Write a protein that binds this DNA or RNA. Structure first.
Ligand SMILES: Nc1ccn([C@H]2C[C@H](O)[C@@H](COP(=O)(O)OP(=O)(O)OP(=O)(O)O)O2)c(=O)n1
Ligand SMILES: O=C(Nc1ccn(-c2ccccc2)n1)N[C@H]1CCOc2c(Cl)cccc21
Ligand SMILES: [Ca+2]
Lengths: 945, 353, 352
DNA sequence: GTCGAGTCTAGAGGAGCC
DNA sequence: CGGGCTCCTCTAGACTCGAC
């Protein structure tokens, strides 16, 4: 039968699939190993508990090449990366003539032959290049000029927005406004910026051009952590410091120094392309072109040094193939993108005005404390600047009425000329106090609005203006210790307010800080969610909403003024920090000619609508764990009912005739850690208590580790993710207690501590995984257990001895997860190319993969994704040598098939800026989440057509 | 009730206390609005006209008569929607038969109370394609609520409710939370083509509006606000006894005064400044023409109750150096600015508000 | 007659062609006004307000209702009665001083059918000694205001008349092509009405004139803003309605000449928003696709009393030049786009 | 030539993602 | 001993520069 079990009674894979992944002949675990596993499981009280068998799956998988799974993946990745390694080798051997002395002032592409001449060309027409793009930030996101290095010649490009000057250029970018190019490899430093400026990249159909990044390879070879970058910059200007000499920050100058050495790399002192205007660029064309040539030459010289070191420390072809596939992200958009930007900005402005109305009102109503010097009796605003300045100095007939009008006009016309005794620029609100003055926009300010329009909840004066009290004590700010409050004991006026509050140190908290020396009062810091060592920067944080609703934090005006202020702050906190990124996103709109015929002919095609794309500017390896990095799309918030503009990802909408098919891995790092611990203890699945708990439980049934923790301690499931992954990678009991108190408001100090030890109870459940991680991390050259990729030279034990231990131990599992992502991308590309599944890679977040599939091939894409997950899990098992895979983790829980990017297929993104919803406003129906059996039924268990 | 006391003291309202009970104001049986009441209502109508008609390429004014002739004796109009529906076909030719387009009007309507209550109402009949009718209704609900909250010191007191007609037609109702309760200030209805088809029986080709590339009969969206109760709403929202109406709504902008002496020259200075601010669209209260000449504190309180934005004080020193004093109602603080830069700033403070 | 056809066609009036007649326009029984007619009436009312109430502290606005309750009410027939009712309580505005006036614009209902007319009225309370002088002063100012916007101010006339009682009064006319019609009337009505409305204890009607208390005299200045609009349409009438710049409803016609449509529409929309923020009314002719001939567009805008027709073309994106055409003179000039708003404001101010 | 008003970085606390 | 990232606003100290 297809039902199979291990010596420890865990349902393994179906027989048909096992005969195709592992074949036959794997070594039996042995009696001693099984006895040890049974003893461990019985000791932890986990033996003898049956589980309902999951239904068997019978699949005819595509023919796997080679003799086993590793050879299969190697062959796939070598076929993927073979031409691009050839292009890199071409860039690694050829020698280049020196840059020409006189650049060409021409529109288009220019090729510099020998003796510095300039020849007009249509495209660089080279397999391998080093590319750099210069963009004038004053004219928007259109490229300005670019210099490209070929293994044979120099190349230069200039936009028509540089050669020609016109009154107005289109704000809506088009492919014709981009840099023309196009089996090609393009190398650069932060190539994703330069990829975004290539004309042919925005086409919906894919292109064979791939990109290699110097920051990514630097992070792969000699990269630095964020704390490491801080320490390195502090030093360039722990007991281990040998890592400094073999590492650098991602800046091109620093990387060139690290790898190639030689004379220092110099930057343009004026920074024209960021601060200057187009006239400056036309005036200074030669200098800026020479600087671009210098940067591209430095990048070429750095790539020459990095490529062999990268191929040495990361020898598996899957790593390079995945890094090539991870850098071709693609996000399609439409006119709903413009509507979303407009609506989100409008909602943000409306809420901003609503909050500033209350703000300005109270401030304008506090100026009366100046009259009579009454601010000394105000418990809040006594410390501010109340001093005032001075203004410094250096019937009638028709004829009678006309004459009187002219005389009354001339009387002031004489007075209108006495301006000679006044300064050129008038003093700003000389009469009002200094505090009021600072909060009013100056008259010259381009955007001027009447009143204290420069006031916000983040200002250090706002809580005093709104008279916020914590347990009835006025909030007081200490520069050394952040925010806080004053317990009495205007000290006379502070007690009077507290006495009134009681009608409507004896107080225990963060202790009376004696440094503040406020007379007749004590200082207590506001309880911060991350402990007593941290300082509060603003009482209007999200963590203070429960305390405001409970009434321990109160507003002076009372009523809903305080809670509404905190609610509006929570609504606009994301947009306030991300609107510059989201609004400025480089959107390029495709004309009807460049669109595919499927999009044009589809019923949902709109003749009056726009269709475009956003290429995420992804740093492929921007992490010591070799993760991707993106300022916007890797920080894009999920749709929440209270957050303005949080439907950002829902605006990534497939064109007509297309859908987004993707999935997210389930308990990825939990399973990776458990399988490592299992392979360390005995060569079976479920040997350890942690591995048995991980396997025993389904996400649909709500019994997995995250859901079990959420039920046990009461927090949400994402809060349980934070809790569990913190505990795995180093969080102590105080961290767990603080996280529980933060995410579960009903718990007390004692109750949270007890529920921490319940999750921290376990010779233990988690012993073997910890031992394996600490053994690999302390190895002479730590490497990924699956693809064998080495750690950065800055984190090896020789470079850092007994330092950054948490970073390395977490690096093991996290870089293994990156290996998982590389394997998934490789296998998905292989299945898409082999069976002609029309589609392409859309975007990957650190454990999610999205594919812009055509409508007719959504279920084939779903089956391909399930097969990919199956093969990747079996590869993880095979490298560790377990020679089996549980049926519990063989496939995805569900594959999302949606027309927009959202966490759940059923949730509707009803946010303050999107109150109607995606269905009512933009006409986006709900998607479907399908597990393995449903996909098998829909596609007959085959990827063919 | 102190608000109505101050309003009748400062000529926002008329009559005695008997006619100024809140029931009389709400019903419409009060006498006419006072002069400052006329100015405040004019400012509300001007802001409404700006937002709805001025900045939109497809909203046009319409002249609907106050009486409904014929079926034997005629009647006074109760709503402005009927005349706009009568002008629908005529104004279809302006937008070249392209939907959506609107017909806006501010007028007086007569509601039975058997007394007659007169209400000034601002209407927008917004012909829309049937498919996007709910979208346009939600857009107009949000726009109108934002407009009412734009001039509000407490925008939360302006609310909306989703209501259904006795025939099941969708609609929304705006409100202002008065101290006594929650009164209706505006109403939107997605009427449909019922009224258009009833008023224009027979062929429907004349009623067709070109939505995109297809002809369609518009679904009438009726927006109707109460500018009298809206004026009362803003008087309550505004209300040291100070109104604090909006700078774009305050009836009288600038109060102009004098100093010590010489009287004759300062009179000429004030006359020139008065004419300047008048020619620049800024309404001025000539306090220099008063003969009683009370103290500064009494004038300050008097002007505070009248929602006076600024108090210009031309003293003798305005002759010497051209500097004039200015007190702001917002903060009760005095500042000095030159006589050459008063008009430009006043235009700035108002426009940017 | 052709002017009425133009007004109906260009949305100055409303209703069917056979529905609009001279008598129905003079009486108040016409269907109403088109959007251009409504805006011309608003312009006339704003000019009347500027020339009467805006530039005089002594003149205040009032709010008289349409119906008079009590002895089963009826529609108001004139704006005088409400002003006389408001006379007593309005003395606190002037601190019981004298003279002072009350002015208003509103619809007055006249039996004919029910005729509605937009009548602009001003009542002037004065001591009887200077009553004739104030009457002559107001007559001068009103005739100056009427002739200010006129292409041919000879058509506006003035006359002297006596009522049945025998009080001095003037009648202001406009010489329509069919004959002179009453567009305004001034009467020195005395104190009969004020005493009849307020009998007994005349101490409440005393006005201070040099510390002397006087029961005042009322001057009635009743114009016809609807007949004023008709007079200006007739006087302003190649078919061109050369309305005065301060009265013409829409000033600028903004259009698109070439492609690309997106960029030209963008620059036209920016120009539209700029001109609107600067108080200039613009006809958004750039929205229309498949435009007619430029000559036909010029004729249409001339019949609509459009001051200037601005055409934005492909060249505008290159340098900023826009084709500018004037209503009064059929002369085309090219001006930079950034200088258009200041030019329009300057032209409006100059013709004022 | 003195000193006070604009510009500029650096650091700290808050807030999105996995 | 959570880890790996990303960016923002606000405040303070130092520098520049210009007008009197
Ligand atoms: N606070 C967090 C969040 C995430 N991760 C890491 C561990 C996860 O394996 C990976 C992906 O995050 P998910 O939130 O997707 O975690 P799971 O994949 O376990 O959850 P799910 O089963 O819902 O996908 O990121 C982490 O270490 N700490
Ligand atoms: O709202 C504002 N904005 C601003 C911003 C700079 N400003 C300025 C204006 C003139 C000279 C200097 C500075 N003004 N100012 C109000 C608030 C306080 O009161 C007044 C008064 Cl008394 C007079 C004028 C304006 C105001
Ligand atoms: Ca996951």
């Amino acid at each position: 039968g297809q039902l199979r079990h291990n010596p420890l009674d865990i349902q393994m894979l179906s027989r048909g699939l096992h005969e195709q992944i592992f074949g036959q002949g794997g070594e039996m675990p042995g009696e001693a190993a099984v006895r040890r596993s049974v003893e461990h499981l019985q000791k932890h009280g986990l033996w003898g508990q049956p589980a309902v068998p999951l239904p068997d799956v019978e699949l005819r998988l595509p023919p796997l090449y080679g003799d086993n799974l590793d050879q299969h993946f190697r062959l796939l990745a070598q076929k993927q990366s073979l031409p691009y390694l050839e292009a890199a080798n071409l860039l690694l051997q050829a020698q280049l003539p020196p840059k020409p002395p006189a650049w060409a002032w021409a529109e288009g592409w220019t090729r510099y032959g020998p003796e510095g001449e300039a020849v007009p060309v249509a495209i660089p027409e080279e397999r391998a290049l080093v590319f750099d793009v210069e963009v004038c930030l004053a004219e928007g996101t259109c490229p300005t000029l670019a210099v490209a290095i070929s293994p044979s010649a120099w190349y230069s490009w200039c936009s028509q927005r540089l050669v020609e000057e016109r009154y107005s250029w289109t704000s809506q970018l088009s492919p014709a406004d981009l840099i023309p190019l196009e089996e090609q490899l393009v190398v650069g430093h932060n190539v994703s910026f330069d990829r975004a400026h290539i004309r042919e990249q925005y086409l919906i159909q894919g292109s064979r051009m791939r990109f290699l990044d110097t920051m990514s390879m630097h992070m792969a070879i000699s990269g630095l952590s964020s704390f490491q970058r801080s320490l390195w910059i502090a030093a360039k200007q722990i007991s281990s410091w040998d890592w400094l000499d073999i590492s650098s920050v991602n800046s091109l100058a620093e990387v060139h120094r690290l790898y190639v050495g030689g004379p220092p790399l110099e930057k343009e002192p004026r920074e024209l392309f960021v601060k200057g205007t187009m006239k400056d660029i036309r005036e200074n064309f030669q200098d800026l072109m020479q600087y671009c040539a210098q940067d591209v030459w430095a990048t070429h010289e750095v790539f020459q040094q990095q490529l062999p070191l990268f191929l040495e420390r990361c020898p598996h072809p899957v790593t390079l193939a995945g890094m090539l596939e991870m850098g071709v992200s693609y996000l399609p958009v439409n006119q709903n993108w413009e509507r979303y930007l407009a609506e989100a900005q409008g909602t943000y402005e409306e809420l901003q005005r609503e909050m500033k109305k209350s703000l300005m009102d109270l401030t304008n109503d506090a100026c009366q404390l100046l009259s009579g010097e009454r601010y000394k009796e105000d418990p809040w605003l006594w410390d501010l600047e109340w001093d005032l300045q001075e203004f410094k100095q250096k019937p009638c007939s028709e004829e009678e009425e006309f004459q009187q009008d002219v005389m009354a006009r001339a009387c002031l016309q004489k007075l209108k000329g006495t301006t000679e005794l006044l300064p050129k620029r008038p003093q700003h609100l000389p009469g009002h106090p200094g505090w009021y003055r600072k909060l009013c926009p100056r008259l010259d300010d381009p955007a001027w609005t009447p009143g204290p329009s420069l006031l916000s909840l983040q200002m250090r004066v706002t809580p005093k203006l709104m008279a916020l009290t914590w347990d009835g004590f006025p909030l007081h700010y200490s520069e050394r210790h952040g925010w806080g409050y004053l317990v009495p004991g205007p000290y006379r006026a502070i007690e009077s307010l507290y006495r009134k509050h009681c009608l409507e140190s004896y107080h225990h908290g963060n202790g009376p800080y004696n440094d503040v020396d406020i007379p007749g009062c004590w200082f207590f810091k506001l309880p911060h969610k991350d402990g007593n060592s941290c300082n509060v920067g603003s009482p209007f944080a999200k963590d203070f909403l429960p305390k405001m609703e409970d009434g321990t934090l109160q507003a002076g005006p009372g009523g809903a003024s305080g809670p509404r202020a905190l609610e509006i702050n929570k609504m606009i906190s994301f947009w306030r920090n991300a609107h510059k990124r989201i609004s400025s996103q480089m959107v390029v709109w495709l004309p009807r000619s460049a669109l595919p015929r499927a999009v044009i002919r589809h019923p949902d095609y709109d003749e009056e609508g726009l269709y475009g794309a956003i290429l995420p500017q992804v740093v492929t390896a921007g992490t010591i764990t070799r993760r991707a990095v993106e300022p916007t799309w890797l920080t894009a918030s999920n749709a929440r009912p209270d957050r303005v503009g949080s439907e950002l990802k829902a605006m990534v909408q497939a064109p007509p005739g297309y859908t987004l098919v993707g999935a997210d891995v389930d308990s990825q790092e939990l399973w990776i850690a458990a399988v490592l611990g299992d392979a360390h203890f005995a060569g079976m699945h479920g040997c350890t208590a942690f591995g048995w708990m991980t396997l025993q439980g389904r996400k649909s049934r709500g019994t997995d580790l995250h859901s079990k923790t959420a039920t046990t301690v009461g927090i949400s499931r994402e809060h349980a993710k934070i809790f569990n992954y913190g505990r795995i990678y180093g969080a102590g009991q105080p961290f767990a207690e603080r996280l529980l108190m933060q995410f579960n408001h009903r718990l007390t100090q004692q109750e949270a501590a007890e529920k921490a030890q319940q999750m921290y109870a376990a010779g233990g459940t988690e012993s073997e995984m910890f031992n394996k991680l600490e053994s690999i991390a302390t190895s002479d050259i730590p490497r990924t257990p699956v693809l064998g990729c080495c750690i950065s030279r800055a984190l090896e034990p020789s470079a850092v001895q007994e330092e950054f231990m948490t970073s390395r131990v977490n690096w093991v599992v996290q870089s293994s997860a990156v290996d998982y992502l590389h394997l998934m991308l490789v296998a998905m590309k292989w299945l898409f190319e082999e069976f002609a599944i029309d589609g392409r890679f859309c975007i990957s977040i650190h454990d999610e993969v999205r594919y812009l599939v055509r409508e007719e091939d959504r279920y084939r894409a779903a089956l391909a994704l399930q097969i990919t997950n199956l093969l990747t899990r079996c590869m993880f098992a095979y490298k560790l040598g377990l020679n089996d895979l549980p049926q519990s983790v063989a496939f995805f829980s569900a594959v999302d098939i949606d027309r927009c990017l959202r966490k759940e297929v059923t949730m509707d993104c009803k946010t303050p800026s999107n109150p109607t919803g995606m269905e009512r406003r933009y006409g986006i129906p709900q998607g479907e989440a399908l597990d393995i059996y449903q996909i098998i039924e829909l596609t007959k268990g085959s990827l063919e057509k | 009730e102190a608000l109505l006391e101050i309003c009748q003291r400062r000529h926002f309202l008329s009559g005695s206390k008997q006619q100024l009970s809140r029931d009389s104001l709400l019903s419409g049986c009060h006498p006419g609005f006072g002069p400052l009441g006329v100015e405040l209502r004019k400012n509300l109508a001007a802001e409404w006209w700006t937002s709805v008609v001025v900045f939109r390429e497809q909203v046009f004014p319409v002249d609907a008569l106050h009486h409904k002739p014929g079926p034997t004796s005629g009647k006074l109009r109760e709503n402005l929607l009927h005349g706009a529906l009568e002008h629908y076909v005529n104004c279809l030719d302006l937008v070249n038969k392209r939907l959506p387009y609107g017909l806006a009007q501010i007028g007086v309507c007569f509601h039975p109370v058997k007394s007659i209550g007169e209400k000034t109402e601002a209407s927008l009949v917004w012909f829309t394609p049937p498919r996007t009718s709910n979208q346009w209704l939600d857009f107009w609900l949000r726009h109108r609520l934002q407009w009412w909250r734009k001039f509000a010191m407490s925008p939360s007191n302006f609310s909306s409710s989703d209501c259904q007609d006795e025939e099941g037609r969708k609609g929304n109702k705006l409100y202002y939370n008065f101290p006594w309760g929650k009164e209706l200030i505006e109403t939107l209805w997605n009427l449909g083509d019922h009224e258009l088809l009833h008023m224009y029986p027979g062929n429907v080709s004349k009623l067709h509006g070109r939505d995109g590339r297809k002809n369609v009969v518009p679904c009438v969206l009726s927006v109707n606000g109460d500018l009298d109760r809206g004026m009362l709403a803003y008087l309550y929202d505004s209300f040291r006894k100070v109104l604090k109406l909006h700078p774009c709504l305050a009836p009288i902008k600038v109060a102009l005064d004098v100093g010590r002496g010489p009287t004759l020259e300062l009179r000429q200075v004030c006359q020139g400044l008065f004419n300047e601010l008048l020619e620049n669209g800024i309404s001025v209260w000539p306090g220099y023409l008063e003969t009683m000449q009370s103290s500064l504190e009494q004038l300050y309180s008097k002007y505070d109750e009248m929602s006076i934005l600024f108090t210009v004080l031309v003293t003798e020193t305005t002759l010497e150096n051209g500097l004039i004093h200015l007190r702001s109602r917002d903060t009760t603080m005095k500042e000095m600015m030159h006589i050459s830069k008063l008009k430009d700033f006043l235009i700035k403070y108002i426009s940017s508000a």
